[PDB]
Amino acid sequence: AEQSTSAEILETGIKVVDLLAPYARGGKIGLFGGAGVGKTVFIQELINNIAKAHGGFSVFTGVGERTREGNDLYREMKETGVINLEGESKVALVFGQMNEPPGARARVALTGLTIAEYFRDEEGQDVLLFIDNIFRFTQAGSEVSALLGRIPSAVGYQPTLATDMGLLQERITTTKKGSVTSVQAVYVPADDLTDPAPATTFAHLDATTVLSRGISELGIYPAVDPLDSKSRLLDA
Amino acid sequence: IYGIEGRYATALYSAASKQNKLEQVEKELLRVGQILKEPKMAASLLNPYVKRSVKVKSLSDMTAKEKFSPLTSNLINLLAENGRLTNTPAVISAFSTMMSVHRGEVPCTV
Amino acid sequence: NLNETGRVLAVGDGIARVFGLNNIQAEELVEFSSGVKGMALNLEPGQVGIVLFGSDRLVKEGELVKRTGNIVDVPVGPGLLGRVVDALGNPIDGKGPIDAAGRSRAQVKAPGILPRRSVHEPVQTGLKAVDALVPIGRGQRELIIGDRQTGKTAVALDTILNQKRWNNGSDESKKLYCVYVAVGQKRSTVAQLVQTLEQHDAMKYSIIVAATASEAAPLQYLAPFTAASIGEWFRDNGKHALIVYDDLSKQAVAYRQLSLLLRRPPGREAYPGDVFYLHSRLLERAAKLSEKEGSGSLTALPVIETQGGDVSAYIPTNVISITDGQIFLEAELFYKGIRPAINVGLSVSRVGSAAQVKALKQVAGSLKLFLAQYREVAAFAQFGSDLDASTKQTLVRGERLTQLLKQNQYSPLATEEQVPLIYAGVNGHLDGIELSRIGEFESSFLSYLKSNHNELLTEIREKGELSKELLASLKSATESFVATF
Amino acid sequence: NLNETGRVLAVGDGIARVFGLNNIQAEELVEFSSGVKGMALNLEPGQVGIVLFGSDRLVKEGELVKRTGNIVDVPVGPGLLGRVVDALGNPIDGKGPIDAAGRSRAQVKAPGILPRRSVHEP
Amino acid sequence: VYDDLSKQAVAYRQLSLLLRRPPGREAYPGDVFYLHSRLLERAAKLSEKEGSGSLTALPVIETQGGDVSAYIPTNVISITDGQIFLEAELFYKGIRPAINVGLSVSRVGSAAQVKALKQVA
Amino acid sequence: STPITGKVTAVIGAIVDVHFEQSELPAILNALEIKTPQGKLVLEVAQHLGENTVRTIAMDGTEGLVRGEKVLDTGGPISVPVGRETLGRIINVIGEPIDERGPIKSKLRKPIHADPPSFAEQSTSAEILETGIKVVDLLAPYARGGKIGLFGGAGVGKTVFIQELINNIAKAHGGFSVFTGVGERTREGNDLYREMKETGVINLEGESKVALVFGQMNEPPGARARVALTGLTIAEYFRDEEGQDVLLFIDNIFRFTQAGSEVSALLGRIPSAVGYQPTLATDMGLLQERITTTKKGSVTSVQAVYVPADDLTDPAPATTFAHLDATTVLSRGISELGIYPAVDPLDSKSRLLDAAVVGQEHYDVASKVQETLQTYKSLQDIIAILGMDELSEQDKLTVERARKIQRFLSQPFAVAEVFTGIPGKLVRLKDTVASFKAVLEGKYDNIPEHAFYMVGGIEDVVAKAEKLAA
Amino acid sequence: LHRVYREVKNRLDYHISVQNMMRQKEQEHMINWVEKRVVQSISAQQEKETIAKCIADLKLLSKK
Amino acid sequence: LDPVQKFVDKIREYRTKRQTSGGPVDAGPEYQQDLDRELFKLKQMYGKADMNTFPNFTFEDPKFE
Ligand SMILES: Nc1ncnc2c1ncn2[C@@H]1O[C@H](COP(=O)(O)OP(=O)(O)OP(=O)(O)O)[C@@H](O)[C@H]1O
Ligand SMILES: Nc1ncnc2c1ncn2[C@@H]1O[C@H](COP(=O)(O)OP(=O)(O)O)[C@@H](O)[C@H]1O
Ligand SMILES: [Mg+2]
Ligand SMILES: [Mg+2]
């Protein structure tokens, strides 16, 4: 009953976005492409824009984040201005190192989700939740369910996989008070989309912003690929 | 009677003797014998379907509602720890002979 | 006692389950009546599962076992340099007792988010195809993945040898102590590997942690962590240490063995869920400490052996996901002659130029381009001369640029000697030279500079950069030699 | 008493856990009260695992079991020529008893390394 | 002539599983190899002292989808003195019997073949 | 005497459980004995289940064991005969004579189980070993006192290969040799024993220079898993105590893992990936470590490895590579072409494949041959899709040569003379290198390819090419 | 020069390695000797069968 | 446990051993044998010279290639 009865577009601040693959308000967006395409640069952007257009804060969540990258990220964010120590920050950071046990890894996401829901139900803002990467979240579960003794499903993943995915994606939605838009990266295991983990993830994704090397190679910034970027809200 | 199996009771009641629970350990041990004769028990005291630490819990039900609990609330888990609930009746018999040697092995000055 | 001691209930498969020790710690060492030691990994309410470091022939039933009150610890410090120790840290070379400056726990927590710095100190491997294409950085985790007999060890091995250029110097923040971790390798191999470093005077700054295949599984389990601490010492004290895990593949197999025998849940390919937590908790230990922490640094070069190029396997996928780049090697490329066979196409480095000498960066930025277009137009080389001139030009370069990367083993070159070769290659001063004489070209060219243009080489070695003056002076010296050739 | 006999504890799927038989050999033939014969493959203190050569709808808990004392063997010799027998070597063609010359076991050791000749006969 | 050991292993697999004996690969008992090894080795040529007697064996196996890389088949290919591979595809082409020479070999070779026929081919 | 009595309590396949008395339990890896009317069924301690119960592994047929037979503790691991007394005699796993020559009079009896030599004892050598096989001596030459591996699927040529090596090294070796048949055709042994008499290596009424240990496939999982150790122990003796060169021939070494793989399930071991047992790396390890050269004596080892389903990614083969200095991989894809021994020139490598070992000239010639055969295989997609005419002048000239060298690698063995009909030919390394060198320079671009197929020395190529022209 | 060093140091290190080996060995037989004198203490001393029922009945209790 | 403490019994036996001066306590001919064996491995490791003595040196002439 608290769910909305209509999907609306969420103005980001990028032509390549609003015109081609627009972000769904309270939907799930898939971000492809690793370092080299300025992934980090494309993230801090969405945090600024929305902070000025919708004035909604952002929450970054790192599951099995590389301690190396976590450092350079934090530092970069202070150089861009998305995070000011003396002034006012706009985004909260919640990293989950890789050297941590599966237990913690599989909960990092929920930790960041909680903080985000606060500004949705309390302050009613269009908060953005960033998850990198939704893949290690499934892997985390797989190691946990593995140790517990639970029998391995198809491909080795956990049987409970189906329910877990929903205990995170469903919580990210637009309510009557506020809304939470998820911008989580996606990793394709062995360049195969038949695999359960990806298959299950895409079932919630509403849009996908791909970042190709060949796009940034032509001097096009951001490296967003117009052909690959698609949205489920691209209708009259 | 043999020794190793008979020592089990004597190595458990040994502490019992110091207290004088031979009655609570000898009378209890008698229970373990009837439990083995119970056809329904044979399907529980030797069922590999339960577990190694699970079946031990269900024992408490036959340890707190049969006679055990004190000098038998240890020998119970030990009797079902490795799976010696097949020839355990022989261990109880030794108790009757070892329980009589404790009466003489005491400073009889009074 | 029953609290500090225990009785062996059952023994086998190099794992004995003991009863007692109600106060024993997790992963704590213990000592049996016979003398063989072990560590308890499983702590059950009734019994305690303990792995063995020696034959299970020594351990019997009912045997007595006592605590050690100490977790797996290994002695660290500069005394190890030039020695050869086992997983535990005992001498096996026969050079006497070791002189350590302290001990460190096998299990150490990686440096936090804050106490680190963006890698910026290059790790010259002395490999042209590496330092030019895939640059490695002090604190980086570069993975040497490849099939059997491809040249994985060659990469690391040359790297170590290429360190005599700084370790015999005076400055410390420039040196680099090398820690090799032999896992699952026969003794004969180690004895040779060691004997090679000596004939090159490299043992002077190398630490060998041998973990032969005949040794108990747990030894092969603790080896990487043991050696990990040893190098961290250097890192903590404000220095530089290079550690090469050769190979992690064997380690996982060992660990799998213990886990299965202990009856822990089996996952993909019979690997327990904590197998990833194993390597992630190992590689993350190496990094680049900040200025406040000591500016110290620990580089990691883990080795993974694939089965027919299958990088999609479980173990490899784990490792590749954690590291920060790969030096993929293919047997095929090896057969053609391209040695070391480093697949430029796959080999990548996330840090890149951040950790590469600007002297070489100025001539390498373009070298990745030509090679890139060469792999695309490589099929055309098989067809008649009917190829247009445009594409043909690419083939002329590629053939020669690929021929230059071919570097003999045990023959590392300093940056001062790399730049001149890359600069002549990129511009295309070799295109006129036959593709058969490219080898001798390097020889006669280097000897030329070191007798007529020695002043140029030495300026590149010290400055580390190429000014407009040098770029012109280097070009003039090249065109002169190519002319007289 | 139970040295040469035993009582069935469970039975199903052609398997029968009989209790007793503490002098039966490994892979020894046995006979139940029903008439159906069986083979002992698993020797354990508690019970003995036996496999049935026939249907198991005839064996029931608490049934008597007897032993053969001999390893499962089959009749051998020229007599069999032209006859059609079953595993055990009994006639199934219906042409009289099997006139065998000797009886040899099922499991026989392979011929020696010494007593061999290189194959030359087509 | 055994026809076929492929079924025999399935049978022997059934006793194992039912006797609650742990399976190896594809449920077959660990010693499944030892099932055919101690069978085929029983056939061989005896010494002149023994009687010059002999026993020849023609084991038969049933592959699935032409997959000779299977568990049981590989176990037997390793023991037998060669194999007469038969392909379905050659059968239709009109090669009958469809013996694939490319894969069919005899380890005894010409030693066993007739001397006359040995010359002409 | 004061022996320890015992009693069998369980019998499942090749796994026998004995129940001893308190304080009387034998350590792991101890032998046992059970008196039978026929013979003796030795057992080997494996685990200690507890409650004075031990689980052993039947060294022979388990049929005929009665619930509760009294077992006699040997008091120590399986003892095998050692010394020159075992020369010229056939021995099984238990160390009993099986050649009908009466008892083996040995002064000592050393256990089959022992620890691997110390890292300090390890001695590295760089000497080369001349066999006589072109494709080997030119590409991957074997090292004196080194470990050799002959990989290959079923029916590739691993046996004939290792057999020739014996026909060219064993006689030509002034020392002792040990052959160990593990999990193979009993008939192959027979032929072997026959040839050793006919060659003169083994003399029944004279001296011998080789011992024979067989534990073929007809034997139960217990035997095939320890027969490798039985023969190793006899070799090792000549290594340290005799202090002299020794040739160890193992065939096949894959049965060592397999055999253990069968019983691992029954010993309550959770099957590892691919079905193999978890203890693969260690077991395969504790065997190869012992097979090595120490400062006391030199041991040249020739172990043939089996490749299940022609798959090299299989753990068993995969693990074995690291314990080898010289690897000679055999490809079935090479057999089918008719070229034998089906040796893969690219995949086969060696330790002595160094300029500073085989010579500078030797390395260059070897490298050229490899590069030629590689480009050939690289153009295989053009020679069928565009023909030979489309290839460039440099390509066609190379391709022709690659085809000549390829066929030039084939060599007739005196052992497989019954297969090829052509008399064996042994080529010397000094001439081998000189042959390809000449062919690489194009000095024989006129001679026909069929003149290089199944030919020994280079002289024979020219002789053959001339005999065909007639 | 290097050779003189290696060789002398080598002679020196020998003494340490030896010394070290002796210590280890001895302290093996030393702590192991403990075993056989304690298996003699319980097996013998019938008054070390009283210190049996003792410490052990102090198990049942605590746990609960 | 408190009874578990009553360490005492171990010390006493440590004490009697340590109080013994006449080689390694309760010899057994094996000790020497093992000793000698390990004493031999170290010879292998460290070389065949008299380690009680200062070393001789005859140096190699230089070598030219
Ligand atoms: N750069 C090189 N130049 C010439 N030869 C090389 C080079 N690198 C490796 N080799 C050759 O490679 C062989 C060993 O290769 P290498 O040890 O590098 O592979 P690896 O990764 O160790 O494989 P494995 O896992 O079997 O040890 C040697 O025989 C040597 O001749
Ligand atoms: N030199 C050779 N020339 C041609 N064929 C050979 C040669 N050596 C072996 N073979 C073939 O290989 C077969 C024997 O294979 P074998 O050596 O037993 O291989 P595997 O080791 O795989 O069992 C022979 O029948 C023969 O046809
Ligand atoms: Mg290597
Ligand atoms: Mg063979």
Tab-separated table of N, CA, C and O in Angstrom, chain C residues 1-2 7 19 22 31-35 45-46 63-64 66 83 91 94-98, chain G residues 9-10 13-17 20 24 28 31-32 34-36 38-39 42 55-56 59 63:
chain	number	residue	atom	x	y	z
C	1	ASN	N	45.477	-33.384	34.215
C	1	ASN	CA	44.955	-32.026	34.346
C	1	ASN	C	43.635	-31.816	33.591
C	1	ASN	O	42.663	-31.320	34.166
C	2	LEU	N	43.617	-32.192	32.310
C	2	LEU	CA	42.434	-32.091	31.435
C	2	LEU	C	42.183	-30.689	30.868
C	2	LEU	O	41.421	-30.528	29.913
C	7	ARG	N	43.994	-36.161	25.737
C	7	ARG	CA	44.299	-37.506	25.270
C	7	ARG	C	43.832	-37.694	23.841
C	7	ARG	O	42.729	-37.281	23.478
C	19	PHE	N	40.956	-34.981	23.081
C	19	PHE	CA	39.953	-34.671	24.098
C	19	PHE	C	40.578	-33.997	25.311
C	19	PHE	O	41.529	-34.513	25.895
C	22	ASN	N	40.462	-27.760	27.697
C	22	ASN	CA	39.279	-26.907	27.790
C	22	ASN	C	39.583	-25.412	27.830
C	22	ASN	O	38.668	-24.588	27.872
C	31	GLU	N	51.769	-29.607	21.530
C	31	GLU	CA	52.891	-30.540	21.421
C	31	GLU	C	52.568	-31.942	21.942
C	31	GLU	O	52.126	-32.111	23.082
C	32	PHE	N	52.809	-32.938	21.097
C	32	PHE	CA	52.499	-34.331	21.414
C	32	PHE	C	53.657	-35.011	22.123
C	32	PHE	O	54.798	-34.556	22.055
C	33	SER	N	53.346	-36.121	22.779
C	33	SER	CA	54.335	-36.894	23.512
C	33	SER	C	55.555	-37.215	22.646
C	33	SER	O	56.689	-37.194	23.123
C	34	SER	N	55.318	-37.499	21.370
C	34	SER	CA	56.387	-37.902	20.461
C	34	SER	C	57.345	-36.758	20.139
C	34	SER	O	58.556	-36.959	20.057
C	35	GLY	N	56.793	-35.563	19.954
C	35	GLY	CA	57.590	-34.396	19.616
C	35	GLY	C	57.012	-33.570	18.479
C	35	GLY	O	57.231	-32.359	18.404
C	45	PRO	N	32.720	-28.793	21.205
C	45	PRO	CA	32.307	-28.913	22.609
C	45	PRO	C	32.828	-30.179	23.275
C	45	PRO	O	33.129	-30.168	24.471
C	46	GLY	N	32.919	-31.260	22.512
C	46	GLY	CA	33.390	-32.522	23.048
C	46	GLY	C	34.883	-32.708	22.873
C	46	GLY	O	35.602	-32.974	23.835
C	63	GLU	N	47.612	-41.126	23.446
C	63	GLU	CA	48.831	-40.365	23.675
C	63	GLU	C	48.514	-39.016	24.311
C	63	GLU	O	47.446	-38.446	24.086
C	64	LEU	N	49.445	-38.508	25.110
C	64	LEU	CA	49.242	-37.246	25.811
C	64	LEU	C	49.678	-36.055	24.961
C	64	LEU	O	50.631	-36.145	24.190
C	66	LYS	N	50.051	-31.560	25.175
C	66	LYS	CA	50.035	-30.384	26.043
C	66	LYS	C	50.052	-29.078	25.257
C	66	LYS	O	50.568	-29.021	24.144
C	83	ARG	N	69.386	-16.373	4.085
C	83	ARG	CA	69.121	-17.666	4.691
C	83	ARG	C	67.998	-18.374	3.952
C	83	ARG	O	67.435	-17.836	2.998
C	91	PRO	N	66.031	-22.854	10.403
C	91	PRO	CA	67.050	-22.955	9.353
C	91	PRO	C	67.077	-24.333	8.692
C	91	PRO	O	66.924	-25.344	9.372
C	94	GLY	N	71.709	-24.839	6.881
C	94	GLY	CA	72.844	-25.268	7.683
C	94	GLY	C	73.907	-24.196	7.852
C	94	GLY	O	75.101	-24.460	7.692
C	95	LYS	N	73.466	-22.984	8.181
C	95	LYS	CA	74.355	-21.841	8.348
C	95	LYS	C	74.335	-21.363	9.789
C	95	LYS	O	74.813	-20.271	10.098
C	96	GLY	N	73.759	-22.175	10.666
C	96	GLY	CA	73.670	-21.838	12.074
C	96	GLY	C	72.313	-21.301	12.475
C	96	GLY	O	71.408	-21.195	11.648
C	97	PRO	N	72.158	-20.968	13.764
C	97	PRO	CA	70.916	-20.392	14.291
C	97	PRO	C	70.667	-19.002	13.723
C	97	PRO	O	71.611	-18.271	13.427
C	98	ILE	N	69.398	-18.641	13.589
C	98	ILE	CA	69.008	-17.363	13.014
C	98	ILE	C	69.066	-16.243	14.038
C	98	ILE	O	68.871	-16.482	15.223
G	9	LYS	N	83.453	-18.016	8.302
G	9	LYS	CA	82.095	-17.907	8.849
G	9	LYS	C	81.410	-19.277	8.830
G	9	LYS	O	80.803	-19.702	9.810
G	10	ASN	N	81.549	-19.965	7.710
G	10	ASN	CA	81.069	-21.308	7.559
G	10	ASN	C	81.553	-22.235	8.680
G	10	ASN	O	80.769	-23.031	9.213
G	13	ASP	N	79.706	-20.883	11.952
G	13	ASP	CA	78.313	-21.323	11.933
G	13	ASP	C	78.102	-22.820	12.189
G	13	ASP	O	77.030	-23.239	12.658
G	14	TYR	N	79.120	-23.617	11.886
G	14	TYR	CA	79.022	-25.033	12.061
G	14	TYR	C	78.842	-25.313	13.539
G	14	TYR	O	77.935	-26.065	13.943
G	15	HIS	N	79.698	-24.693	14.343
G	15	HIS	CA	79.641	-24.873	15.784
G	15	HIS	C	78.282	-24.528	16.338
G	15	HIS	O	77.739	-25.295	17.135
G	16	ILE	N	77.717	-23.403	15.902
G	16	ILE	CA	76.350	-23.046	16.325
G	16	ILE	C	75.290	-24.073	15.922
G	16	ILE	O	74.526	-24.539	16.775
G	17	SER	N	75.254	-24.418	14.632
G	17	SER	CA	74.314	-25.406	14.126
G	17	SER	C	74.415	-26.684	14.934
G	17	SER	O	73.393	-27.173	15.419
G	20	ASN	N	73.197	-26.100	18.529
G	20	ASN	CA	71.739	-26.072	18.403
G	20	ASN	C	71.083	-27.448	18.296
G	20	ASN	O	70.070	-27.710	18.949
G	24	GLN	N	68.466	-29.251	21.040
G	24	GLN	CA	67.198	-29.809	20.614
G	24	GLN	C	67.096	-31.273	21.029
G	24	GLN	O	66.152	-31.666	21.719
G	28	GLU	N	64.642	-33.181	23.625
G	28	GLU	CA	63.622	-34.103	23.149
G	28	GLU	C	63.542	-35.233	24.158
G	28	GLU	O	62.536	-35.408	24.850
G	31	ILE	N	62.131	-33.968	27.537
G	31	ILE	CA	60.704	-33.747	27.737
G	31	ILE	C	59.934	-35.018	27.419
G	31	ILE	O	58.844	-35.248	27.930
G	32	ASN	N	60.519	-35.850	26.569
G	32	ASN	CA	59.921	-37.131	26.262
G	32	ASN	C	60.100	-38.075	27.444
G	32	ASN	O	59.200	-38.846	27.780
G	34	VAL	N	59.848	-37.375	30.209
G	34	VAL	CA	58.721	-37.033	31.052
G	34	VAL	C	57.598	-38.043	30.858
G	34	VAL	O	57.020	-38.533	31.828
G	35	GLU	N	57.301	-38.355	29.603
G	35	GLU	CA	56.205	-39.263	29.288
G	35	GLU	C	56.320	-40.563	30.071
G	35	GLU	O	55.442	-40.896	30.865
G	36	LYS	N	57.413	-41.285	29.851
G	36	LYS	CA	57.565	-42.625	30.406
G	36	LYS	C	57.668	-42.667	31.929
G	36	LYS	O	57.483	-43.719	32.534
G	38	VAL	N	55.722	-40.593	33.705
G	38	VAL	CA	54.366	-40.263	34.121
G	38	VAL	C	53.404	-41.398	33.782
G	38	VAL	O	52.364	-41.547	34.411
G	39	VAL	N	53.759	-42.198	32.780
G	39	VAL	CA	53.006	-43.411	32.480
G	39	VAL	C	53.344	-44.458	33.525
G	39	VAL	O	52.616	-45.433	33.709
G	42	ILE	N	51.052	-43.201	36.949
G	42	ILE	CA	49.637	-43.543	37.026
G	42	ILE	C	49.414	-45.048	36.985
G	42	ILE	O	48.623	-45.583	37.764
G	55	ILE	N	39.903	-35.247	40.500
G	55	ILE	CA	39.848	-34.181	39.508
G	55	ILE	C	38.719	-34.348	38.484
G	55	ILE	O	38.221	-33.361	37.942
G	56	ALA	N	38.316	-35.595	38.234
G	56	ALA	CA	37.322	-35.896	37.201
G	56	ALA	C	35.875	-35.625	37.618
G	56	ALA	O	35.071	-35.171	36.807
G	59	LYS	N	34.271	-32.357	37.038
G	59	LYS	CA	33.884	-32.057	35.664
G	59	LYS	C	32.372	-31.863	35.588
G	59	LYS	O	31.889	-30.760	35.322
G	63	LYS	N	30.576	-27.804	34.520
G	63	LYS	CA	29.824	-27.713	33.272
G	63	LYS	C	28.379	-27.246	33.513
G	63	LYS	O	27.966	-26.203	32.995
